[PDB]
C-alpha cells in the first residue's frame, strides 16, 4: 500500500496535473509537477510517465528510483515499456510479467504484457494476458483487437468472426486489426 497522502492544497494540484496529462498537455503537466515538491512519490511517478511519453532520457531513472517505493508496480511497468521502446522484448516481457503480478487488476498492464508475450512468442500466455485485459475493460477497445489480431496470426478466421459478432466490431476497427496483425511478428 501507499501510506502517503497530500493536503487539499497540493492534491487539488495533482488533480490539475492529471487534467493536463489527459488533455495532451503532458509538458504543462511536467511544469506544474516541477512546481510541486520533488521527491513526492505521486509527483515522481507522474513526472516519469510524462518523461517516458515525451521521449526524455530521465524517465528511466525516475522509474528506477520508484521501483524501491510504494510506486513499485508502475515503475516496473515503465521500465518494461522502455524496454519495448528500445525493442528489447526479452527483459520487457519479464518486467511486464512482474508488474502485472504485483497489481493484477490494471487493464493497461495486462494489455501491455499480452503484446509483449505475443512479440516474444508465448502465444498461449499472450492469449491468457489479452483475455485478462479484455475482460477487465468494459468490452475493451485495444484489448479486443489485441485478441482479434492474435487470432488472425493464429489463423482461426471463424473464431475471429465469432468475436466480430460478439464484440460487434466495425470495419473501421477491422482495418486496424489487420494492420496490427501484420505488426505482430
Amino acid at each position: 500500500e501507499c501510506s502517503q497522502q497530500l493536503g487539499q492544497e497540493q492534491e487539488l494540484q495533482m488533480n490539475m496535473v492529471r487534467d493536463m496529462i489527459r488533455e495532451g498537455r503532458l509538458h504543462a503537466a511536467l511544469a506544474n509537477l516541477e512546481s510541486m515538491p520533488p521527491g513526492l512519490l505521486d509527483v515522481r511517478e507522474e513526472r516519469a510517465l510524462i518523461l517516458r511519453r515525451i521521449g526524455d532520457p530521465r524517465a528511466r531513472a525516475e522509474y528506477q528510483a520508484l521501483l524501491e517505493t510504494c510506486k513499485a508496480p508502475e515503475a516496473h511497468h515503465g521500465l518494461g515499456l522502455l524496454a519495448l521502446r528500445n525493442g528489447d522484448s526479452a527483459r520487457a516481457v519479464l518486467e511486464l510479467r512482474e508488474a502485472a503480478r504485483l497489481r493484477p487488476t490494471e487493464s493497461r498492464f495486462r494489455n501491455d504484457l499480452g503484446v509483449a508475450l505475443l512479440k516474444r512468442g508465448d502465444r498461449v500466455g499472450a492469449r491468457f494476458e489479452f483475455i485478462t485485459a479484455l475482460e477487465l475493460q468494459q468490452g475493451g477497445k485495444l484489448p479486443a483487437t489485441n485478441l482479434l489480431g492474435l487470432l488472425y496470426l493464429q489463423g482461426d478466421r471463424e473464431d475471429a468472426q465469432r468475436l466480430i459478432e460478439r464484440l460487434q466490431l466495425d470495419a473501421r476497427d477491422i482495418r486496424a486489426a489487420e494492420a496490427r496483425a501484420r505488426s505482430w511478428g
Partner: protein, 244 residues
C-alpha cells in the same frame, strides 16, 4: 429518444484567515500598576482601600492564552494567526421523461425542514431536438447557532447555496448557469494614545483583529438524451497495439 438525463456539477472553494493579539499585566509591592487591554479587565474589581485587586482574571477563548506569574509581575497574552480551507463537490444525476417533473434528495430532515443535496428539474425536448431545462439545484448543510421556541428547540442554521433558472441547450452542450467570486476583509486596531506609537515597545500597547475570507462557486448543467439499458445488459454497480 424522448428521455433526458441531466448532469449537474457543483464546486465551491473558500479560504479564510484570522489574526489577533493583546497583552495585559499587573505589578505589586508598595506600588501597584495595571494595564488591561480592551475587554480584558472586566472580570475584576478593586477594593475601596486600594490594598489589592478583588477579582479573578479570565482568559480569551478564541486564541492561544499564555500567562506568566513572576512573583510581583503577572502578565497575560492572547495571540492567534489561523487559516482555513474548505472544498465541496457534488455531481447529482437524474433521469426524467420529456415534459415530466422530477425531484431528488440526498441529505436529510430535521425537526420538518430538508437539507443536503437537492435537485428539482423539468426537461422538455423540443421538435428541433434541443433541450429546454427548468432546473433548481441546491447544496445545503447544517450550521450550529441560534435557537427557537416553536416548532423546534435549539434548531441549527443552514449554510445554503442554491440556484433557479431556465435555459435551452442542445444534446451534450453545457452552461455555467451560476457563478460567484467573493472577498471580505475586516480590520481593527486599538492602542493606548501616546504609548501605542512607540516604534518598538508600542506593540505591547496595541490590540489587533483581522478577518479575511474568499470564495468561488460554479454550477454547471449538462443534459443528455438517453435510452434504457437492454434486457441483457449488465447493470452498473459499485464496489503497435500498446496502450502508449
Amino acid at each position: 429518444p424522448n428521455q433526458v438525463q441531466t448532469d449537474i456539477r457543483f464546486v465551491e472553494v473558500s479560504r479564510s484567515k484570522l489574526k489577533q493579539a493583546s497583552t495585559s499585566f499587573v505589578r505589586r509591592g508598595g506600588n501597584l500598576w495595571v494595564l488591561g487591554a480592551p475587554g480584558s479587565l472586566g472580570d475584576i474589581k478593586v477594593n475601596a482601600d486600594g490594598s489589592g485587586l478583588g477579582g479573578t482574571f479570565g482568559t480569551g477563548s478564541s486564541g492561544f492564552n499564555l500567562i506568566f506569574g513572576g512573583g510581583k509581575w503577572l502578565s497575560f497574552m492572547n495571540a492567534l494567526e489561523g487559516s482555513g480551507f474548505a472544498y465541496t463537490l457534488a455531481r447529482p444525476s437524474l433521469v426524467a421523461m420529456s415534459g415530466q417533473s422530477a425531484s431528488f434528495l440526498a441529505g436529510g430532515e430535521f425537526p420538518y425542514k430538508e437539507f443536503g443535496i437537492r435537485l428539482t428539474l423539468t426537461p422538455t425536448v423540443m421538435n428541433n431536438r434541443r433541450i429546454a431545462l427548468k432546473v433548481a439545484p441546491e447544496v445545503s448543510e447544517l450550521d450550529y447557532s441560534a435557537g427557537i421556541q416553536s416548532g423546534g428547540v435549539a434548531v441549527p442554521a443552514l449554510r445554503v447555496r442554491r440556484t433557479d433558472t431556465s435555459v435551452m441547450l442542445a444534446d451534450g452542450e453545457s452552461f455555467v448557469i451560476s457563478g460567484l467570486t467573493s472577498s471580505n476583509s475586516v480590520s481593527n486596531v486599538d492602542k493606548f494614545p501616546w504609548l501605542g506609537d512607540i516604534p518598538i515597545l508600542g506593540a505591547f500597547f496595541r490590540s489587533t483583529k483581522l478577518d479575511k475570507d474568499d470564495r468561488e462557486l460554479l454550477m454547471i448543467v449538462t443534459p443528455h438524451l438517453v435510452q434504457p439499458l437492454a434486457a441483457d445488459a449488465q447493470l452498473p454497480d459499485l464496489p503497435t497495439g500498446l496502450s502508449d
